[PDB]
Design a protein around this nucleic acid. Structure first.
Ligand code: PRO
Ligand SMILES: [Mg+2]
Ligand SMILES: [Mg+2]
Ligand SMILES: [Mg+2]
Ligand SMILES: [Mg+2]
Ligand SMILES: [Mg+2]
Ligand SMILES: [Mg+2]
Ligand SMILES: [Mg+2]
Ligand SMILES: [Mg+2]
Ligand SMILES: [Mg+2]
Ligand SMILES: [Mg+2]
Ligand SMILES: [Mg+2]
Ligand SMILES: [Mg+2]
Ligand SMILES: [Mg+2]
Ligand SMILES: [Mg+2]
Ligand SMILES: [Mg+2]
Ligand SMILES: [Mg+2]
Ligand SMILES: [Mg+2]
Ligand SMILES: [Mg+2]
Ligand SMILES: [Mg+2]
Ligand SMILES: [Mg+2]
Ligand SMILES: [Mg+2]
Ligand SMILES: [Mg+2]
Ligand SMILES: [Mg+2]
Ligand SMILES: [Mg+2]
Ligand SMILES: [Mg+2]
Ligand SMILES: [Mg+2]
Ligand SMILES: [Mg+2]
Ligand SMILES: [Mg+2]
Ligand SMILES: [Mg+2]
Ligand SMILES: [Mg+2]
Ligand SMILES: [Mg+2]
Ligand SMILES: [Mg+2]
Ligand SMILES: [Mg+2]
Ligand SMILES: [Mg+2]
Ligand SMILES: [Mg+2]
Ligand SMILES: [Mg+2]
Ligand SMILES: [Mg+2]
Ligand SMILES: [Mg+2]
Ligand SMILES: [Mg+2]
Ligand SMILES: [Mg+2]
Ligand SMILES: [Mg+2]
Ligand SMILES: [Mg+2]
Ligand SMILES: [Mg+2]
Ligand SMILES: [Mg+2]
Ligand SMILES: [Mg+2]
Ligand SMILES: [Mg+2]
Ligand SMILES: [Mg+2]
Ligand SMILES: [Mg+2]
Ligand SMILES: [Mg+2]
Ligand SMILES: [Mg+2]
Ligand SMILES: [Mg+2]
Ligand SMILES: [Mg+2]
Ligand SMILES: [Mg+2]
Ligand SMILES: [Mg+2]
Ligand SMILES: [Mg+2]
Ligand SMILES: [Mg+2]
Ligand SMILES: [Mg+2]
Ligand SMILES: [Mg+2]
Ligand SMILES: [Mg+2]
Ligand SMILES: [Mg+2]
Ligand SMILES: [Mg+2]
Ligand SMILES: [Mg+2]
Ligand SMILES: [Mg+2]
Ligand SMILES: [Mg+2]
Ligand SMILES: [Mg+2]
Ligand SMILES: [Mg+2]
Ligand SMILES: [Mg+2]
Ligand SMILES: [Mg+2]
Ligand SMILES: [Mg+2]
Ligand SMILES: [Mg+2]
Ligand SMILES: [Mg+2]
Ligand SMILES: [Mg+2]
Ligand SMILES: [Mg+2]
Ligand SMILES: [Mg+2]
Ligand SMILES: [Mg+2]
Ligand SMILES: [Mg+2]
Ligand SMILES: [Mg+2]
Ligand SMILES: [Mg+2]
Ligand SMILES: [Mg+2]
Ligand SMILES: [Mg+2]
Ligand SMILES: [Mg+2]
Ligand SMILES: [Mg+2]
Ligand SMILES: [Mg+2]
Ligand SMILES: [Mg+2]
Ligand SMILES: [Mg+2]
Ligand SMILES: [Mg+2]
Ligand SMILES: [Mg+2]
Ligand SMILES: [Mg+2]
Ligand SMILES: [Mg+2]
Ligand SMILES: [Mg+2]
Ligand SMILES: [Mg+2]
Ligand SMILES: [Mg+2]
Lengths: 136, 197, 172, 191, 193
RNA sequence: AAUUGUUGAAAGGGAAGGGCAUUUGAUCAGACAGGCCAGCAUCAGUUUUGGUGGCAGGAUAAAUCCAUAGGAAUGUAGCUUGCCUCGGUAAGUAUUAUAGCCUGUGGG
RNA sequence: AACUGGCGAUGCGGGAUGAACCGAACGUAGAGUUAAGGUGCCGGAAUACACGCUCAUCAGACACCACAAAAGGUGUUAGUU
RNA sequence: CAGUCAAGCGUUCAUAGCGACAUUGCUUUUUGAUUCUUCGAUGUCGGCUCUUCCUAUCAUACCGAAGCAGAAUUCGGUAAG
RNA sequence: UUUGCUCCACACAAUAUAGAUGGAUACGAAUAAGGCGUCCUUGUGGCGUCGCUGAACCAUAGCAGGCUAGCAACGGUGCACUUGGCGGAAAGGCCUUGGGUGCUUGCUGGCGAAUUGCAAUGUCAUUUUGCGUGGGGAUAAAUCAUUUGUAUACGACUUAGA
């Protein structure tokens, strides 16, 4: 019998909190929170992703559980030098978020004929699995 | 989209559900609302008690029957929030209304069908955290609604049979995602993977 | 009144035979377009000098672009406004990233807290606060404490279809 | 003006483990075990070290932050109430009619029976709350004592008796008859 | 409350039978004649209903009927109605009921001396009745014209409808009444000079 | 003619009747033998909604970026100190070091 | 009483409703764009965006317009000396 | 019919209960003022009867205050069941 | 009273229709928190994982989906039968046994398609009724008149009558 209290483990508005934009010419791109203006405004920069240094409501972005070392107020180049360094992109590329994005990006590139190949493909998987699902 | 849309009222703000139900109705979409007693209303219970009493006092003077009818059950309160958002005295309004059903609890059919939710009327999403609100069941029962206990009895038994149902289900989908893993890394699976699947 | 640009404006008391090269006064107006900006310039000059538009002329109207638009600043702001019962000066502090983006929220704050519309405010002075701890007001000082972080709880997601089959989270 | 974060500390002792899933609380120590619901309030707890727990209000209004501290209280009382305990003492006070008090039971009941209040042939009853134990003090006259771990269950079972003995229809300053809480403290002595 | 079944005696008196008809004398009296067949087989189809009640039913009522022939009336067509049963256990209530089919029950197993009982009956009727006797309205004065067993002012001017709370000439009597708190001063026996 | 009986069709949840429009029912003209209607293409007038190219201004945008000089703290490295489970803390020095930022000037 | 604009003698769109207000004045139509006013649902039209403020055990919600005052508040808000 | 300031009344003590000079309101069972509706007609006092509603509550329910010892009274709250 | 009534079967006919045209796809509860997997001391438990929308899942190729051959499987699904069982809130539907049978695009074949002429919903839903056919099953009552008076202006009520 130790005490045992929950957690409630939030993502936080902090320097170097990577943040996935959601609407605007940058929408879809990642970025880092440089300095923090207030309870709503934040200053983000994302020179890796081609997103310009800006202020932006936290409304228009969604915080991601990724975070790296960044000096507060760090200018753009220093941002690029730490982002790199920290190995952000592969860290996000690895994730179940960013994959499930690619996932749906792909399903929407599909060629009518490509779709058709997906159907038979699934017919093929289904046959063998519906089988296994009856042998143990 | 669907022939009939079943709505789990629990957690939904009266007028904001009534508003979306009215519009689905008029655009030809049959709708059924369930567990109406678990429906929510902004403001603490007293304000909404007081409100129902203000309603309650209006009646035709020379003959209280011909005047406004006050209905106690959480669903009839819900239908009332709805009907006034519908041009209900027209041919078209009676039309749209007949597409709608409202119930306390989840009675047969609809207990085995899937019931769906309305984010734009979901209190837990709509209201500000810290406001006070009202549950339609408590509010109904305080003005004459009789069957509040029977319903929660019938439901407390429903939610049992359904946990079993879900239980068997979760047990089976453990096999299915199990078989689904033998099939991975195969030729088929890695191909689908390329096509997004 | 709109989305704001800063304009320097410059005018001078139309020349006369016995006073060619009158004296030139500048203001910095906070307005949306150049037509309003000159209007304000004359509004305020006739509050100090014997001019009016009728007898003067604008010499130059030039936009002023914020010097470091990705440098968060702490802005002190000085205001005079009319209430429903008299007129009074104020001072507020706005934390933002360009003198102009601050003047925007000022007019919003003045409007929300003091029901004062554009017509009743006068922007006495806007100034970048250099050293911290000259930041007097608290609603700002909160954001200047070291290694500051904070969650954003009870997060709420913009549903794009009318019906949902889940049951939301507010997790974050 | 929305203060961005504020927090209060809940010291924890050696005899006690409080446990908070969602916002249900259960302090448990020597004297028993107390559980109280805080879902109505919206703070974030945080175990830090079997002796410390923190509670927090992020971006709160003056009214919200206010209820922070008073969440900390209600859990200190739950702590202190389960280590020491809570002892409330009230003494009868009359002028001519001895207020005569007893513990009567009807259906496993345990009430506090009060007869001959200001004479009243009426018999007054206050039900004994669960988790509270009433003792008639020996060695002191017209004292009754209510003990237990729930500060809020004692203090109410306290005032239920006192207020069952309000005086009607008489100048209530010359007629000071009643039973009044005379002293609230803890169950373990020294402390 | 909703009723979900109703199990019946195997044999039904020409009393209760007479109630199910309006021109008995002409009728071929075939009521319940197919229901009574359900006993012919082992029981099964009546056991299953009796069993239903037990598994379900939050309330159990007994259908009884008066032995009107044992009464000086001329009226043969016995009265029948449902009596709720208030002893323990649902399953026991039906067992008790099952047990009594066609058997008889008398007043003493219901009421006792000095018991307080309520009566439920339909008030003597009096046909169409002026407002004076039907509501107790004041008689109007003798000098008054076109009659006086009336209300004089049927209504205000507004609202401009005679209203539901005014007293007005109508049927009086033949009303249902539930009277409470009558003492039993005697539960007499028939076999008892 | 008002008004009436029959028969036939039709509508009718506290009047009836009317306007625009269409469903359906009934009824009818004309027009084929180029009549009625459509569908695509190329164009014309009106118009609405997109993708894209070349240029002009401004502090010849303001920034980033690069160079340079100065600087400070919501003080990075180091050092000192004090407890402290063999370092982690905390409070001190300390302006670039094992992070960085601000301000001016110059360049594209 | 004065000047103008109106209603009367004038429909159309907005103001639920309404002689006089807002918009705009009328041959028969088609396509487009709008005014005043609006766009949760009734009801065509963003349960749009952004900053604040407000929680009322008789909240409040748009000119004309269908009324409220002095005086108070340790509700909360932002300001002043 | 109800307020606000509070000089005073109240042995003392402004506000238990009252309250000057001033000043702010409300109500539409007073009375005026107006002449919009009805003069090819809205039957015109009072009572009788009988219904319903309002509350600015006389009584009855449960309360707070007192210049309430008790009894009586008084000011006030929830209140038209 | 002209061989009527009813349940199952098919046939022709009529008449509908607030609006089929792959599938309404079942925990409960919280939201300042939870779902899922896994481990154990079965907890207000350790550990892992996920969300950021159903943009999903399932289904979906074949004369509107015809005729046929085979292989690999022993899986799937349609149908009519049967085994055991569950469901009364409006259950009227759900789960299960076992054979028979159709299909299988899991894979490999043989054959057909045009001329509906370059589009004209190009017709494939489900309502209700009506008439004959024969596979089961069933043989009442209510009203008028008469009548009681526990009823009544009249209707109505309440009785009574092989
Ligand atoms: O009424 C009254 C008037 C007075 C004169 C005659 N009629
Ligand atoms: Mg968690
Ligand atoms: Mg897709
Ligand atoms: Mg429809
Ligand atoms: Mg009415
Ligand atoms: Mg309505
Ligand atoms: Mg409709
Ligand atoms: Mg919300
Ligand atoms: Mg101006
Ligand atoms: Mg001026
Ligand atoms: Mg001014
Ligand atoms: Mg949106
Ligand atoms: Mg008193
Ligand atoms: Mg007294
Ligand atoms: Mg049955
Ligand atoms: Mg008869
Ligand atoms: Mg006789
Ligand atoms: Mg009679
Ligand atoms: Mg008489
Ligand atoms: Mg009378
Ligand atoms: Mg006479
Ligand atoms: Mg009446
Ligand atoms: Mg009617
Ligand atoms: Mg010809
Ligand atoms: Mg032609
Ligand atoms: Mg044509
Ligand atoms: Mg053209
Ligand atoms: Mg261009
Ligand atoms: Mg350029
Ligand atoms: Mg340098
Ligand atoms: Mg750093
Ligand atoms: Mg005008
Ligand atoms: Mg004119
Ligand atoms: Mg005229
Ligand atoms: Mg005119
Ligand atoms: Mg006009
Ligand atoms: Mg109009
Ligand atoms: Mg308008
Ligand atoms: Mg409406
Ligand atoms: Mg609309
Ligand atoms: Mg109100
Ligand atoms: Mg009030
Ligand atoms: Mg009122
Ligand atoms: Mg309101
Ligand atoms: Mg105004
Ligand atoms: Mg209006
Ligand atoms: Mg005043
Ligand atoms: Mg005021
Ligand atoms: Mg204030
Ligand atoms: Mg001031
Ligand atoms: Mg006065
Ligand atoms: Mg004075
Ligand atoms: Mg005094
Ligand atoms: Mg005093
Ligand atoms: Mg004095
Ligand atoms: Mg005073
Ligand atoms: Mg007035
Ligand atoms: Mg008046
Ligand atoms: Mg009066
Ligand atoms: Mg006149
Ligand atoms: Mg007059
Ligand atoms: Mg007249
Ligand atoms: Mg007349
Ligand atoms: Mg008159
Ligand atoms: Mg009249
Ligand atoms: Mg006359
Ligand atoms: Mg005194
Ligand atoms: Mg006295
Ligand atoms: Mg006395
Ligand atoms: Mg009171
Ligand atoms: Mg009354
Ligand atoms: Mg009333
Ligand atoms: Mg239809
Ligand atoms: Mg379910
Ligand atoms: Mg579970
Ligand atoms: Mg979990
Ligand atoms: Mg689990
Ligand atoms: Mg084990
Ligand atoms: Mg477990
Ligand atoms: Mg766990
Ligand atoms: Mg899914
Ligand atoms: Mg096939
Ligand atoms: Mg083939
Ligand atoms: Mg083989
Ligand atoms: Mg096979
Ligand atoms: Mg049932
Ligand atoms: Mg149903
Ligand atoms: Mg059933
Ligand atoms: Mg098979
Ligand atoms: Mg196929
Ligand atoms: Mg076809
Ligand atoms: Mg036949
Ligand atoms: Mg015979």
């Amino acid at each position: 019998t130790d005490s045992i209290v929950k957690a409630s483990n939030w993502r936080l508005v902090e320097v170097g909190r990577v943040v996935l934009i959601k609407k605007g010419q940058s929408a879809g791109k990642l970025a880092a929170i440089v300095e923090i203006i207030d309870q709503k405004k934040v200053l983000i920069d994302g020179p890796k992703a081609g997103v310009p240094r800006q202020a932006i409501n936290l409304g228009q972005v969604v915080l991601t559980p990724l975070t790296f070392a960044l000096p507060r107020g760090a200018r753009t180049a220093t941002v690029s030098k730490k982002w790199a360094a920290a190995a952000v992109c592969e860290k996000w590329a690895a994730s179940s978020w960013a994959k499930k994005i690619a996932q749906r990006e792909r399903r929407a590139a599909l060629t009518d004929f490509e779709r058709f190949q997906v159907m038979v493909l699934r017919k093929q998987k289904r046959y063998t699995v519906k089988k296994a699902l009856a042998k143990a | 989209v669907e022939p009939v849309v079943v709505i789990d009222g629990k957690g939904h703000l009266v007028g904001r559900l009534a508003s979306v139900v009215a519009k689905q109705l008029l655009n030809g979409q049959k709708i059924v609302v369930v567990r109406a007693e678990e429906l929510n209303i902004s403001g603490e219970f007293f304000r909404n008690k007081l409100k129902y009493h203000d309603f309650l006092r209006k009646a035709t003077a020379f003959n209280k029957t011909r005047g406004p009818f006050h209905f106690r059950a959480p669903s009839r309160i819900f239908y009332k929030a709805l009907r006034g958002m519908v041009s209900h005295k027209t041919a078209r309004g009676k039309a749209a209304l007949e597409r709608l059903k409202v119930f306390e609890g989840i009675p047969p059919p609809y207990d085995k069908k899937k019931r769906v939710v309305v984010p734009q009327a979901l209190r837990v999403l709509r209201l500000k955290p810290g406001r006070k609100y009202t549950t339609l069941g408590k509010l109904s029962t305080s003005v004459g609604w009789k069957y509040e206990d029977v319903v929660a009895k019938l439901e407390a038994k429903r939610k049992v049979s359904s946990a079993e149902y879900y239980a068997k289900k979760r047990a089976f989908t453990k096999k299915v995602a199990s078989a689904n893993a033998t099939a991975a890394e195969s030729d088929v699976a890695k191909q689908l993977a390329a096509l997004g699947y | 009144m709109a989305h704001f640009k800063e304009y320097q404006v410059i005018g001078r008391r139309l020349p006369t035979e016995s006073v060619p090269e009158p004296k030139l006064f500048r203001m910095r107006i906070f307005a949306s377009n150049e037509v309003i900006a000159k209007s304000r310039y004359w509004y305020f000059l006739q509050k100090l000098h014997k001019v009016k538009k009728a007898s003067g002329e604008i010499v130059s109207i030039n936009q002023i672009n914020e010097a470091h638009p990705t440098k968060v600043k702490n802005f002190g702001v000085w205001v005079r406004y009319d209430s429903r019962s008299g007129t009074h000066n104020m001072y507020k502090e706005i934390r933002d990233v360009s003198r102009v983006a601050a003047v925007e929220t000022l007019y919003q704050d003045m409007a929300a807290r003091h029901r004062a519309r554009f017509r009743s405010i006068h922007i006495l002075k806007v100034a970048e606060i250099e050293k911290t701890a000259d930041v007097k007001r608290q609603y700002v000082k909160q954001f200047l404490t070291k290694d500051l972080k904070f969650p954003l709880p009870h997060r709420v997601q913009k549903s794009t279809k009318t019906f949902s089959y889940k049951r939301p989270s507010t997790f974050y | 003006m929305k203060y961005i974060q504020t927090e209060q500390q809940i010291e924890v002792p050696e005899g006690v483990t409080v446990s908070i899933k969602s916002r249900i609380v259960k302090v448990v120590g020597p004297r028993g075990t107390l559980t109280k619901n805080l879902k109505h309030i919206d703070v974030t707890f945080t175990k830090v070290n079997n002796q410390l727990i923190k509670v927090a209000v992020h971006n709160g209004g003056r009214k919200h932050v206010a209820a922070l501290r008073t969440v900390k209280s209600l859990v200190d009382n739950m702590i202190t109430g389960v280590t020491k305990g809570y002892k409330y003492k009230m003494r009868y006070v009359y002028a001519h009619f001895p207020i005569n008090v007893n513990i009567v039971e009807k259906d496993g009941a345990k009430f506090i029976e009060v007869r001959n209040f200001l004479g009243d042939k009426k018999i007054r009853n206050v039900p004994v709350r669960d988790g509270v134990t009433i003792e008639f003090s020996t060695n002191v006259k017209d004292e009754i004592v209510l003990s237990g771990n729930s500060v809020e269950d004692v203090s109410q079972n306290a005032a239920d008796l006192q207020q069952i003995c309000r005086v009607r229809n008489k100048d209530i300053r010359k007629f000071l008859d009643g039973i009044y809480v005379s002293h609230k403290g803890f169950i373990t002595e020294d402390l | 409350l909703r009723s979900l079944t109703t199990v019946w005696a195997e044999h039904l008196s020409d009393e209760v039978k007479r109630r199910f008809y309006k021109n008995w004398y002409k009728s071929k009296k075939k009521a319940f004649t197919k229901y009574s067949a359900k006993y012919a087989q082992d029981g099964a189809g009546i056991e299953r209903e009796l069993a239903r009640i037990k598994k379900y039913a939050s309330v159990v009522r007994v259908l009884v009927h008066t032995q009107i022939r044992k009464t000086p009336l001329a009226q043969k067509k016995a009265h029948l109605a449902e009596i709720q049963l208030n002893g323990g256990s649902i399953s026991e209530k039906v067992d008790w009921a099952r047990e009594h089919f066609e058997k008889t029950v008398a007043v003493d197993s219901v009421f006792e001396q000095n018991e307080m009982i309520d009566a439920i009956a339909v008030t003597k009727g009096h046909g169409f009745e002026g407002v004076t006797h039907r509501w107790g309205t004041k008689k109007l004065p003798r000098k008054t014209h076109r009659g006086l067993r009336k209300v004089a002012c049927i209504g205000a001017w507004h609202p401009a409808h005679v209203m539901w709370s005014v007293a007005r000439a109508g049927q009086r009597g033949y009303h249902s009444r539930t009277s409470i708190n009558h003492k039993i001063y005697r539960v007499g026996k028939g076999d008892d000079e």
